[PDB]
Design a protein that fits this description.
Organism (chains B, F, G): Foot-and-mouth disease virus serotype O (FMDV)
Order of helices and strands of chain C: EHEEHEEEEEEE
CATH topology of chain C: Jelly Rolls
Structural class of chain B: mainly alpha
Number of helices of chain C: 2
Organism (chains A, D, E): Foot-and-mouth disease virus serotype O
Subcellular location (chains B, F, G): Host cytoplasm; Virion
Subcellular location (chains A, D, E): Host cytoplasm; Virion
Protein name (chains B, F, G): Genome polyprotein
CATH architecture of chain B: Irregular
Structural class of chain C: mainly beta
Order of helices and strands of chain B: HH
CATH class of chain B: Few Secondary Structures
Largest sheet of chain B: none
Oligomer: part of a larger assembly
Largest sheet of chain C: 5 strands, antiparallel
CATH architecture of chain C: Sandwich
Distance between the termini of chain C: 47 Å
Chains: A mainly beta (220), B mainly alpha (46), C mainly beta (184)
CATH superfamily of chain B: Capsid protein VP4 superfamily, Picornavirus
Helix content of chain C: under 10%
Shape of chain C: elongated
Number of strands of chain C: 10
Number of domains of chain C: 1
Radius of gyration of chain B: 22 Å
Largest interface: C-D, 87 and 88 residues
Strand content of chain C: 25-35%
């Protein structure tokens, strides 16, 4: 006779992410040549690492201006990729289509003041578990980095992945988390005639930044 | 290459499954990301 | 390139005559066996369908490219939607032989029946034009209780002694159609 | 037990251009001998290159007659294969069943006047982008070729494939293109006692002419 | 998972002449011994060649008697296997189940008169295209063979396959052919005291006789 | 042998598909047809 | 050869799938197209 098979129930339904391919209908089509076109990228994290994009602050600006008063807090936000400061970056635009991430997030702080305007800034990482600091003397006990302006205008700080789990969520649904994955705290230490100049800041993926479990929620 | 995970070779030939490429005569952002300056610029003390 | 135009030798001219360069060609779509190896529908009769390839319309692809040749060879592939049992008889058989199931008879299974038929003619090739309505040469006959759809497909097609193809004659300078494109 | 399979949904429907073959029903049939029959052609572009066919002009004639007046334009048309001048050729009869083409189109200009009738003709290629010329002095700045009558009566000119894309459409649907792929411009330069004689013209495929993506629209 | 297959439409219907075999239900049955039984035939054309069978004439007889008058036509018929003279042969009994044939047809003419009865006969082949002859002098311009009676009583003549096509039909449906594949013409030349004796005639397949494309019409 | 044209060997064994033959201790009309006298009996002139 | 693109050999034999050809004792327009005169007839200056 012929070869007997058992058509199994539960198998063969159309799954939208199956590793199978469709059957052809129209054969031997040769494409136009396409080798050595400029701008080839094969992975979205390659252009996320190679190209930093601006942050957002109040007033919808990519910069932060130096205040001259008693309180010296300059910026402060969360390590949610769904944060409002991160919301116009390419890194959050990738991170909205994935549920989990891991690794380092680079922040680029470059200074656009004049040559007679000097400043000294401090970036700090507050881990989750207690409320974040308001003073640079309180944030000196964190993981921090301090730098001042000069001939080299840009300073890159690498916010590390510190967590209990080795993968972290990219959002909360709606309900409640407090401020998990901690805070990024931008402080200024000193300034000399830097009244009202801009410090612009970019953000990009680190060297060991990885982003997994693809998802589609909404908002293209 | 993409989202395919079968280990048995395809029943149809390559001429009928896909469009065939033509040569004349990844991939930039991989080299642009790999050429990133990673160290320090100044003189590291302590 | 000057020549004797009345001698009817084939003379081709290139762009290299005025400083160009001739490029490479891919002609896998205009060969005979590839372009004729696809189904074409014909209008069937009610029960008895004599299988000859001049039931193909002359404005179709397989019909016009078939009628481009004087002589042809092909095996046949048929796909039939029918009610009841479909019966095939070869070339030279009587029509009462269509009433017997010992002849190749495909029983009904939904939605259609696709079967391969050989070349059964007593001639070495068939003809698109016969000098002498050509002679009774064909691929046999089929019948069912009723036949609703009938498709042909020429396989291992060979063609001999080419004949004219005619495009549609426009009224203005160019024949214009609505080529498929997005609205936006 | 027996071998389990998953009958997949979406697969197995009858496609009219599938690479599959039907099941046999009637075996071991031997054909009559068919070797060395005359007139074998395996590709339609082989007989399109080896056999040129006539063009059509006003009055339904394959020729054009030499005018003797101030305006010296002799013929002018488009590089649509669906043009009215190309409409009775075998090359357009192939090109109506394909959506795209590429390569060179040969035009054959042979002269059927008497031995005391001389003439000098000019063929020019106007690329698309501006309106085509009306004078041979204006068409001298194109890609052109000039020849005169003599012992050899036929002159073959190879209209080249100049386009942005490497494949060009064989028709417009109905709506609007202006005159894309440019114009073919036939001009006469001089004539001596060639009043009313005929210049007949054939058309055929070039050496690198190719024609792809089969289609069926109508009109066998 | 399991192996995915595409259950194709149009395939798997029961065809009465498929090369497939059915599934078993009742195993390991050993037959009685059957080697070296007499009368084994493997092909129907082997017994069609090895065993000639009689023809039929008017009066339902396998013979033809010698007439003694002015007109000397003895028998005449067609190369249809569906002819009335061929209708009781085994060769037509095979040929009713096939649509096409090719090759040679042998006719066996053996003479059953007494020893004082002599005769001389002529067999001729009239090809199709004009009306068959009525006189042996008119049939002498055909392919013919002439023989006379003697010690050897049987004469075998091989009617050849002359046709435009290399295969010929075994019947007409009902409508109209004239007398295609020509005529077989039996003539007598001379006879001496052969008044009323019998010439019986057999018919069989030739050496290159072949018979193809099986069919079932009616009449077992 | 008969009207079978599959190139893949059968899934079932020969013991279950057909009846098995037994030896003890085509084909006559092939030899009778091949032993047919084909030439001429007399002396062929011209 | 034609519009077939399977890489697995056919289940049926060649005797049952197609009609078998017979020898006795592409293809003209390929030679007629390849024998086309391509150059120039006269004496090319400049």
């Amino acid at each position: 006779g012929i070869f007997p098979v058992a058509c199994s129930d539960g198998y063969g339904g159309l799954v939208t992410t199956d590793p199978k391919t469709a059957d052809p209908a129209y054969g031997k089509v040769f494409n136009p040549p396409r080798n050595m076109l400029p701008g080839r990228f094969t992975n979205f994290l390659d252009v996320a690492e190679a190209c930093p994009t601006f942050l957002r602050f109040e007033g919808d600006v990519p910069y932060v201006t130096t205040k001259t008063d008693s309180d010296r807090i300059l910026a402060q936000f969360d390590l949610s990729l769904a944060a409002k400061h991160m919301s116009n970056t390419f890194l959050a635009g990738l991170a909205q289509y994935y549920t989990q991430y891991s690794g380092t997030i680079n922040l680029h702080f470059m200074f656009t003041g004049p040559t007679d305007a000097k400043a000294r800034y401090m970036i700090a990482y507050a881990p989750p578990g207690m409320e974040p600091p308001k003073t640079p003397e309180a944030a000196a006990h964190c993981i921090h980095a301090e730098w001042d302006t000069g001939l080299n205008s840009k300073f890159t700080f690498s916010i590390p992945y510190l967590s209990a789990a080795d993968y972290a969520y990219t959002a909360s649904d709606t309900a409640e988390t407090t401020n998990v994955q901690g805070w990024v705290c931008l402080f200024q230490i000193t300034h000399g005639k830097a009244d009202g100049d801009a410090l612009v800041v970019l953000a990009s993926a680190g060297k060991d930044f990885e982003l997994r479990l693809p998802v589609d929620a909404r908002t293209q | 290459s993409g989202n395919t995970g079968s280990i048995i070779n395809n029943y149809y030939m390559q001429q009928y499954q896909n469009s065939m490429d033509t040569q004349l005569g990844n991939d930039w952002f991989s080299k642009l990301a790999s050429s990133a300056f990673s160290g320090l610029f100044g003189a590291l003390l302590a | 390139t000057t020549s004797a135009g009345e001698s009817a030798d084939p003379v081709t001219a290139t762009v290299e005559n005025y400083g160009g360069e001739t490029q490479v060609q891919r002609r896998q779509h205009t060969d005979v066996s590839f372009i004729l190896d696809r189904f074409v529908k014909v209008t069937p009769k009610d029960q008895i369908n004599v299988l000859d390839l001049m039931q193909t319309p002359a404005h179709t692809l397989v019909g016009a490219l078939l009628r481009t040749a004087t002589y042809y060879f092909a095996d046949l592939e048929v796909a039939v939607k029918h009610e009841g049992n479909l019966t095939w008889v070869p070339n030279g058989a009587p029509e009462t032989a269509l009433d017997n199931t010992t002849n190749p008879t495909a029983y009904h299974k939904a939605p259609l029946t696709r079967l391969a038929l050989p070349y059964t003619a007593p001639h070495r090739v068939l003809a698109t034009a016969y000098n002498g309505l050509p002679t009774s040469f064909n691929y046999g006959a089929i019948k069912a209780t009723r036949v609703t759809e009938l498709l042909y497909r020429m396989k291992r097609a060979e063609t001999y002694c080419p004949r004219p193809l005619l495009a549609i004659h426009p009224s203005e300078a160019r024949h214009k159609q609505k080529i498929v494109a997005p609205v936006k």
